[PDB]
Design a protein around this ligand. Structure first.
Ligand code: OLC
Ligand code: OLC
Ligand code: OLC
Ligand code: OLC
Ligand code: OLC
Ligand code: OLC
Ligand code: OLC
Length: 220
């Protein structure tokens, strides 16, 4: 009567743990790309942002450095671009973007702890499937968040937008928020591609860890 209860828990724990790694890797990849400077630096020359924005390369890079420094959850000050103006609707939008990254990070630290605490409880029990269930669940998670796009393309992006932001009938107007000119749509598309690229690598390493383990367990 008891080992029927115990098996019902380790399958629940494997679920809670598997989902926790799926999200942990999603967050970790997101933060690697958002706070990463290699990709955007590459896009300055690739997308010819100096001529898009009528700004020098050094201009563009130091404004970007200040923005990424602002988006740290540990920078308590307001956003003060070195050479660019900014509407109050602009400042609001960047507080929205910053709020997500703090929300994501706080949940990430939560899933990281549950994933390894619950993960070692399972490994102490000679059980490895959370490393395999997780591995495939990390591939599935980031785009289950994209699933609404398949149902309706323009309308789904109206809820993604309003889930994030605090002003509905705003604008991208370069005369009032000229940092738009150095943040073209292609940059965000490539960045998201880097986010999943990182997630894909993440799924592999923890699938490798599943196979390295269970092959040394069956060896005995
Ligand atoms: C007690 C309340 C605590 C709050 C948490 C309750 C949430 C549990 C949800 C359903 C129970 C079913 C438990 C086992 C379900 C099977 C898990 C499963 O679907 O396995 C595939 C997945 O990828 C992972 O392995
Ligand atoms: C945890 C904090 C301390 C340690 C971290 C320091 C903070 C990182 C800031 C700048 C370096 C960014 C440069 C590295 C960016 C590499 C990853 C990236 O996102 O760009 C690669 C791109 O995907 C391929 O084209
Ligand atoms: C349980 C799920 C897996 C557990 C994993 C344990 C944590 C591993 C810590 C760092 C690995 C990668 C961290 C990538 C982001 C940290 C660096 C960062 O944010 O700075 C910007 C970055 O340097 C620009 O590339
Ligand atoms: C969506 C997946 C992309 C993956 C993440 C890559 C992007 C993260 C790097 C920088 C974000 C900074 C810009 C984020 C958007 C700022 C909002 C904006 O454009 O400002 C509005 C305007 O100023 C007032 O109307
Ligand atoms: C509910 C919160 C629980 C309390 C919190 C306890 C701390 C989390 C424990 C381990 C994380 C260690 C591995 C994390 C890898 C670091 C990657 C990272 O966090 O980079 C983001 C950074 O802010 C880029 O600017
Ligand atoms: C594919 C998986 C991707 C993972 C995603 C995780 C969520 C990241 C959350 C916030 C990052 C900042 C989001 C900022 C998005 C703004 C994109 C945009 O198009 O900004 C308008 C720009 O002005 C056009 O020219
Ligand atoms: C043992 C119990 C613990 C179980 C834990 C499960 C094992 C997860 C393994 C790998 C996940 C790592 C995924 C990391 C993906 C983020 C991509 C990244 O960090 O990029 C590098 C960064 O840019 C550099 O500067």
């Amino acid at each position: 009567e008891n080992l029927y209860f115990q098996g019902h828990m380790d399958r629940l724990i494997t679920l809670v743990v598997s989902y926790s790694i799926a999200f942990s890797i999603f967050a970790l990849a997101t933060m690697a790309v958002v706070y990463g400077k290699w990709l955007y630096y590459f896009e300055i020359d690739f997308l010819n942002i100096p001529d898009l924005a009528d700004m020098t390369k050094d201009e563009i890079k130091r404004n970007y450095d200040v923005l990424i420094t602002y988006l740290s959850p540990f920078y308590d000050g307001a956003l003060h671009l070195p050479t660019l103006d900014m509407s109050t609707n602009g400042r609001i939008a960047f507080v929205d973007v910053k709020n997500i990254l703090v929300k994501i990070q706080y949940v990430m630290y939560a899933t990281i702890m549950i994933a390894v605490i619950g993960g070692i409880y399972l490994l102490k029990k000679k059980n490895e499937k959370f490393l395999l269930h997780g591995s495939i669940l990390t591939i599935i998670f980031p785009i289950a968040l994209m699933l609404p796009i398949a149902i309706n393309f323009e309308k789904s992006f109206v809820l993604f937008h309003k889930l994030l932001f605090s002003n509905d009938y705003w604008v991208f107007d370069p005369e009032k928020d000229p940092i738009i000119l150095m943040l073209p749509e292609e940059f965000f598309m490539h960045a998201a591609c880097a986010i999943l690229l990182f997630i894909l690598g993440g799924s592999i390493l923890c699938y490798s860890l599943y196979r390295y383990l269970v092959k040394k367990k069956r060896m005995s």
